[PDB]
Enzyme design. Structure first.
Site, mmCIF file in Angstrom:
data_model
loop_
_atom_site.group_PDB
_atom_site.id
_atom_site.type_symbol
_atom_site.label_atom_id
_atom_site.label_comp_id
_atom_site.label_asym_id
_atom_site.label_seq_id
_atom_site.Cartn_x
_atom_site.Cartn_y
_atom_site.Cartn_z
ATOM 1 N N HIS A 1 0.742 6.017 10.441
ATOM 2 C CA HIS A 1 1.038 5.794 9.029
ATOM 3 C C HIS A 1 2.454 6.269 8.702
ATOM 4 O O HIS A 1 2.729 7.467 8.719
ATOM 5 C CB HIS A 1 0.023 6.507 8.132
ATOM 6 C CG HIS A 1 0.314 6.378 6.667
ATOM 7 N ND1 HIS A 1 0.127 5.203 5.971
ATOM 8 C CD2 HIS A 1 0.782 7.277 5.769
ATOM 9 C CE1 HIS A 1 0.470 5.382 4.708
ATOM 10 N NE2 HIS A 1 0.869 6.633 4.558
ATOM 11 N N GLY A 2 3.341 5.324 8.402
ATOM 12 C CA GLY A 2 4.727 5.638 8.068
ATOM 13 C C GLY A 2 5.003 5.566 6.580
ATOM 14 O O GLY A 2 4.337 4.837 5.846
ATOM 15 N N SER A 3 5.990 6.334 6.137
ATOM 16 C CA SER A 3 6.412 6.331 4.740
ATOM 17 C C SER A 3 7.816 6.914 4.635
ATOM 18 O O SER A 3 8.305 7.544 5.576
ATOM 19 C CB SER A 3 5.431 7.133 3.880
ATOM 20 O OG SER A 3 5.821 7.130 2.518
ATOM 21 N N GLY B 1 5.874 15.306 -0.769
ATOM 22 C CA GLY B 1 4.620 15.243 -1.518
ATOM 23 C C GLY B 1 3.393 14.988 -0.656
ATOM 24 O O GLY B 1 2.297 15.443 -0.989
ATOM 25 N N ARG C 1 -2.420 9.941 -0.679
ATOM 26 C CA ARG C 1 -3.025 9.607 -1.965
ATOM 27 C C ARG C 1 -3.097 8.098 -2.165
ATOM 28 O O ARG C 1 -2.258 7.352 -1.657
ATOM 29 C CB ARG C 1 -2.211 10.227 -3.102
ATOM 30 C CG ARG C 1 -1.999 11.728 -2.971
ATOM 31 C CD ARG C 1 -0.970 12.254 -3.963
ATOM 32 N NE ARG C 1 0.321 11.566 -3.867
ATOM 33 C CZ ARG C 1 1.216 11.739 -2.894
ATOM 34 N NH1 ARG C 1 0.986 12.578 -1.887
ATOM 35 N NH2 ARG C 1 2.356 11.055 -2.921
ATOM 36 N N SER D 1 3.991 0.616 11.440
ATOM 37 C CA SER D 1 4.046 1.781 10.558
ATOM 38 C C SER D 1 5.479 2.296 10.384
ATOM 39 O O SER D 1 5.859 2.716 9.292
ATOM 40 C CB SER D 1 3.149 2.898 11.099
ATOM 41 O OG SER D 1 1.781 2.550 11.005
ATOM 42 N N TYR E 1 7.986 1.384 7.449
ATOM 43 C CA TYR E 1 7.841 2.011 6.133
ATOM 44 C C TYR E 1 8.629 3.318 6.000
ATOM 45 O O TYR E 1 8.701 3.889 4.910
ATOM 46 C CB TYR E 1 6.360 2.244 5.820
ATOM 47 C CG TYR E 1 5.590 0.955 5.646
ATOM 48 C CD1 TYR E 1 5.382 0.411 4.381
ATOM 49 C CD2 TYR E 1 5.083 0.269 6.747
ATOM 50 C CE1 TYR E 1 4.682 -0.773 4.217
ATOM 51 C CE2 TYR E 1 4.383 -0.917 6.593
ATOM 52 C CZ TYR E 1 4.186 -1.434 5.326
ATOM 53 O OH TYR E 1 3.493 -2.613 5.170
ATOM 54 N N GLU F 1 -4.621 -3.833 10.444
ATOM 55 C CA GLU F 1 -4.493 -2.889 9.337
ATOM 56 C C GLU F 1 -5.821 -2.165 9.143
ATOM 57 O O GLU F 1 -6.882 -2.790 9.181
ATOM 58 C CB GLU F 1 -4.111 -3.613 8.047
ATOM 59 C CG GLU F 1 -2.755 -4.296 8.095
ATOM 60 C CD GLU F 1 -2.297 -4.807 6.740
ATOM 61 O OE1 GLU F 1 -3.154 -5.051 5.864
ATOM 62 O OE2 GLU F 1 -1.073 -4.968 6.552
#
Ligand SMILES: NC(=O)c1cccc2c1O/C(=C\c1ccc(OCCN3CCOCC3)cc1)C2=O
Ligand SMILES: [Zn+2]
Ligand SMILES: [Zn+2]
Lengths: 456, 222
Positions: A307-309, A316, A323, A349, A352, A433
């Site tokens: 999971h990338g962001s 956060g 979240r 991932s 992102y 996904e």
DNA sequence: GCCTACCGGTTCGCGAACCGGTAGGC
DNA sequence: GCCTACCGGTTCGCGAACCGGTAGGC
């Protein structure tokens, strides 16, 4: 809020308030057709009026001393109503034709890579630059905290636009929401007209903006606070604020070889624009994330997934976990509705993270996400409620990591096999996904730090 | 909307950007719209009509580029058109329309300064109010709508927003409010309107209406 | 956006004049 | 008993000054 330094009397006399209502308001007005996109800050220090075009040198101000303090209320409430249309007190606000609308303002003992992790995720000037491309006002948004009820309404306007775009609503209907949004959230377009929110991805772009903008104000909320006592070090203060136990997995470790294999193996054939390079491996343990995940260790089919962001969000993500999007936000961009999304491939991932040739480093996660009895989907479908007995959703892709080479890890299935063809090819997805609609189903295990190698 | 602007001086107060002398009242003057440093809005840089053509600006076609061109007096329009530069049935209807376009232009202008001779502003304000019309801000604009009202008719409210339509250059634009956040964008050449009703109080209405005025609709440019 | 010259509408200020009461003269 | 030169006080007439709302300017 505090005194505007444009007055020149900022550290001299305090901004006044009558009991509850603070005599200070920052108004805004935009008309997409005319092109006007203006601000109007009013204060009562002396009365101070500021005005101009948001995000430019266009404008002026007037500081003016009053004859008395009761004349200040007379001059303030008169100027207010003259500009905004309403009285100073009101039960609910109402916009008026060509009048303004008020905006609602509110020696370190750690490893070197761990210090760099805080250095990376708490540099807020890097987060400021990140917003420049979105065209959010850069001037007074860091000191001026935009309200929570305000941003929820800004989300609601975006969701109204998508609804209006989907069923081909009137231009006036769209014009209103576009006006409403840019009034509510001040943008900097310079000397050109605010663009109409008419596309399906334009709302998604502005939805992503709000998501990122929120996390920066959250990153400020962590950074600003605590107990400033002469004992701990500055980096340690910010570490304790993250509320997590981070450790450095050594490169000589046998489990570290599995992750580097999982990175090297599950790179997408189509995503050949860049090449990964694992700088670090961090084992991450959130505060009470094992206490909430205990329920789902009983659940079968548990997978260690990517999971990338954005690096801005990780400030956060550590403090609050992963979240789900708020209920006011639009469903645009999501394939199967609001929830935590995961992928079996590091590359999918890794997109992102939003890295470039100028900003090479980026962060990606690995979480033990309890999928359980899966609801398998081929085409995109915005779901509200899950079918009975289903604890997750799966987007079936063309390519899948080899299921006959699925290595285990602490009782978690790690699909680190290379890509082969899937069972069914009647899908509109190229890769898998994994979606969970409950923040409790995720349990973050590893945080990676990746360098990207492009060709330009 | 437009870059340039032309009109008769609404007051003999504003100075000229090139020579810096007071542009006298009711005189032909031209402007170039610039961004104001002091506030978020366009502002006119007024020039003397004589001085306007020495700054180096070259308007190729005034009627399509300059704002307020159609509102000018017919003979004054030709001065701008010339100074800017420095088949049988087709040409007949083309030529005969320009005859009727002048006929309409200086008909209203005869009617405009007729009311300026006889009536005060308060009479013209109460003229519009009696006909259920929005009273505009400005002296020139008031008699412009009264003259429009008398010749063609009292404009009925808008279909959706229930505002006031106003003649602007080439069409009747709605000036109302579809909502508080946005302005209405209704536009038409053939608006809805009942007949203009002058009150009993008019001892010179027989003189003004005696100027060979029959029933006719607004004619527009090509 | 804010500044200010202009407009009409009323008030204000002050000298001419109007006027009634009067006391010195015949 | 008249007349009349002198004086205090009210009115009247008209231009200066005042003022709030605003259309035009930047
Ligand atoms: N980012 C990923 O790890 C990821 C990996 C593979 C596929 C997807 C991913 O994301 C998808 C969509 C998506 C990503 C982020 C997002 O963020 C919404 C706002 N949240 C940001 C994080 O903090 C909570 C709020 C919404 C949709 C996907 O389709
Ligand atoms: Zn000049
Ligand atoms: Zn309308």
């Amino acid at each position: 809020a505090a005194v505007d330094p444009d007055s020149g009397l900022e550290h001299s006399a305090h901004v006044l308030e009558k009991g509850g209502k603070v005599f200070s308001a920052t108004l805004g007005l935009v008309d997409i057709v005319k092109g006007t996109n203006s601000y109007y800050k009013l204060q009562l220090l002396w009365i101070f009026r500021s005005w101009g075009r948001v995000g430019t040198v266009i404008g002026s101000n007037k500081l003016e001393q009053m004859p008395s303090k009761e004349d200040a209320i007379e001059h303030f409430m008169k100027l207010y109503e003259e500009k905004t249309g309403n009285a100073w007190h009101s039960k609910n606000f109402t916009k008026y034709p060509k009048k303004f609308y008020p905006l609602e303002i509110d020696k370190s003992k750690l490893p070197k890579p761990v210090q760099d992790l805080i250095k990376m995720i708490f540099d807020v000037e890097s987060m400021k630059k990140a917003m420049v491309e979105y065209e959010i006002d850069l001037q007074k948004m860091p000191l001026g905290k935009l309200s929570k009820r305000q941003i929820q309404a800004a989300y609601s306007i975006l969701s109204e636009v998508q609804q209006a775009v989907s069923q081909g609503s009137s231009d006036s209907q769209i014009l209103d929401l576009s006006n409403r949004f840019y009034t509510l959230i001040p943008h900097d377009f310079g000397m050109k007209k605010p663009p109409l929110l008419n596309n399906a991805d334009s709302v998604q772009a502005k939805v992503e903006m709000l998501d990122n903008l929120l996390d920066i104000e959250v990153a400020y909320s962590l950074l600003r606070g605590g107990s400033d006592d002469s004992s701990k070090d500055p980096i340690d203060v910010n570490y304790e604020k993250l509320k997590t136990d981070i450790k450095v997995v050594d490169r000589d470790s046998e489990e570290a070889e599995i992750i580097r294999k999982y990175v090297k193996n599950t790179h997408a054939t189509t995503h050949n624009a860049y090449d990964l390079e694992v700088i670090d491996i961090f084992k991450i343990e959130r505060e009470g994330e094992c206490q909430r995940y205990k329920p789902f260790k009983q659940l079968h089919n548990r997978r260690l997934l990517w999971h990338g962001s954005r690096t801005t969000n990780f400030a956060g993500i550590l403090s609050q976990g992963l979240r789900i999007a708020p209920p006011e936000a639009p469903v645009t961009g999501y394939m199967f509705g609001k929830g935590i999304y995961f992928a079996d491939m590091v590359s999918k991932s890794a997109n992102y993270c939003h890295t470039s040739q100028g900003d090479p480093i980026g962060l990606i996660l690995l979480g033990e996400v309890a999928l359980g009895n899966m609801y398998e989907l081929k085409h995109a479908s915005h779901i509200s409620k899950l079918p009975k007995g289903k604890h997750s959703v799966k987007g079936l892709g063309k390519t899948t990591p080899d299921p006959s080479a699925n290595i285990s890890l602490d009782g978690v299935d790690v699909p680190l096999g290379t890509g082969i063809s899937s069972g069914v090819n009647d899908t509109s997805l190229l890769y898998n996904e994994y979606i969970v609609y409950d923040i409790a189903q995720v349990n973050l295990k590893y945080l990676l730090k990746l360098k990207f190698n492009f060709k330009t | 909307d437009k870059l340039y602007r032309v009109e008769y001086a609404k007051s003999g107060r504003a100075s000229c950007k090139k020579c810096s002398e007071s542009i006298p009242k009711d005189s032909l003057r031209m402007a170039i719209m610039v961004q104001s440093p002091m506030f978020d809005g366009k502002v006119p840089h007024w020039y003397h009509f004589s001085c306007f053509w020495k700054v180096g600006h070259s308007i190729r076609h005034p009627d399509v580029e300059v704002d307020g061109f159609s509102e000018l007096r017919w003979d004054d329009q030709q001065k701008v058109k010339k100074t800017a530069e420095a088949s049988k049935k087709e040409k007949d209807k083309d030529s005969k329309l320009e005859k009727a376009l002048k006929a309409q232009n200086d008909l209203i202008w005869n009617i405009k300064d007729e009311l300026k001779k006889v009536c005060s502003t308060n009479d013209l304000k109460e003229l519009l109010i009696f006909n259920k019309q929005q009273v505009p801000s400005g002296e020139s604009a008031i008699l412009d709508r009264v003259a429009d009202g008398m010749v063609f008719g009292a404009l009925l409210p808008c279909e959706e927003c229930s505002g006031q339509l106003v003649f602007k250059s080439d069409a009747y634009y709605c000036t109302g409010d579809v909502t508080a956040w946005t302005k209405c964008m209704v536009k038409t050449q053939t608006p809805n309107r009942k007949e203009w009703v002058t009150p009993k109080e008019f001892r010179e209405i027989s003189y003004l209406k005696k100027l060979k005025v029959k029933k006719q609709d607004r004619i527009f440019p090509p």
